[PDB]
Amino acid sequence: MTQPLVGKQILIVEDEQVFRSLLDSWFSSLGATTVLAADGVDALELLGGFTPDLMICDIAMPRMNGLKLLEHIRNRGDQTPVLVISATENMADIAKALRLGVEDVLLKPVKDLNRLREMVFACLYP
Amino acid sequence: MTQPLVGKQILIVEDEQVFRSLLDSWFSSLGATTVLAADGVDALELLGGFTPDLMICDIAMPRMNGLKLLEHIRNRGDQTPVLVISATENMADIAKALRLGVEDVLLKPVKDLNRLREMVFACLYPS
């Protein structure tokens, strides 16, 4: 199959339009249905009414650091799988993400589209 | 001002990746914060918990014709401004969109990005 993610809903939270388009383009290519949010506060609001199969965010977020997004939904009882894609070198931040429950924390810029591919597959078909 | 839509939340419902990306690019360029949905059923679900300043959709939608999206939110009592962008030539479909309450129905493909610009401005800053 060239579209193995058909039937999967992916929430992408990404403030850079180009990276946002690449991620939409890639996941859509694979058959996923995407929701994209430019802003992490807007994503928090969306998650009130909607439950995706996977959420992709950055923990180093300009408007509102995505750790707080993660913390707020995890306090509610949301078990939504989260994959972090981040350039952060800050080990206290990564450790806080891991304690809140993320599938993984992948380095940005993505220097292996091969790896993300099987990381996304590890999340969506465990 | 080169970013006149700062503080405006726009929901874009668009099944074509490239057009989706163009609209994201354009609205983001003008300072709006965007939410994009590939799929109209997912947009119906999102609107349960979220109220944008403007929704952009096509009435001629593959998965689920966007008239039903429009009819379902309008039966709830949502006053969310909607702008339809569509190549539809079907006068009955346009007329149903207009009865449901739509800011306007703009012809696709978009000749002219000047027009969409002030159409979007009429929706987001009326009077």
Residue numbers in the entry:
A (entry chain B): 1 to 126
B (entry chain A): 1 to 127
Lines quoted from the article behind this entry:
Overall, the structure consists of five repetitive (αβ)-elements which form a parallel β-sheet (β2–β1–β3–β4–β5–) sandwiched by two helices (α1 and α5) on one side and three helices (α2–α4) on the opposite side. Similar to several REC domains, our structure of RssBN formed a dimer in the asymmetric unit. However, in contrast to many RRs the RssBN dimer showed an anti-parallel orientation, which is mainly stabilized by β-strand augmentation via the terminal β2-strands. This orientation is different to the biologically active dimer of several RRs including PhoP from E. coli. Superposition of RssBN onto the RssB/IraD structure revealed an r.m.s.d. of 1.4 Å. While the core structure of this domain is well preserved (with the exception of small deviations around Asp58), there were clear changes in the conformation of the α5 helix across the structures. From analysis of the B-factors of RssBN (which resemble molecular flexibility) it became obvious that the last helix (α5), in particular, shows higher mobility. This is supported by the observation of limited hydrophobic contacts between this helix and the core domain structure. Significantly, Arg117 is located on the mobile α5 helix of RssBN, which is directly linked to the C-terminal domain that makes direct contact to σs. Based on our mutational analysis of conserved residues located within the N-domain, we propose that phosphorylation of RssB (at Asp58) is sensed by the conserved residue (Lys108) located within the 4-5-5 interface.
In the case of σs, a specialized adaptor protein RssB, also referred to as SprE, is not only required for direct recognition of the substrate but also required for its preparation and delivery to the AAA+ protease, ClpXP. RssB is a response regulator (RR), and as such is composed of an N-terminal receiver (REC) domain and a C-terminal output domain (also known as an effector domain). In contrast to most RRs (which contain a DNA binding domain) RssB is linked to a protein binding domain, and as such represents one of the small groups of RRs (~1% of all RRs). Nevertheless, like most RRs, RssB is phosphorylated on a conserved Asp residue (Asp58) within the N-terminal REC domain.
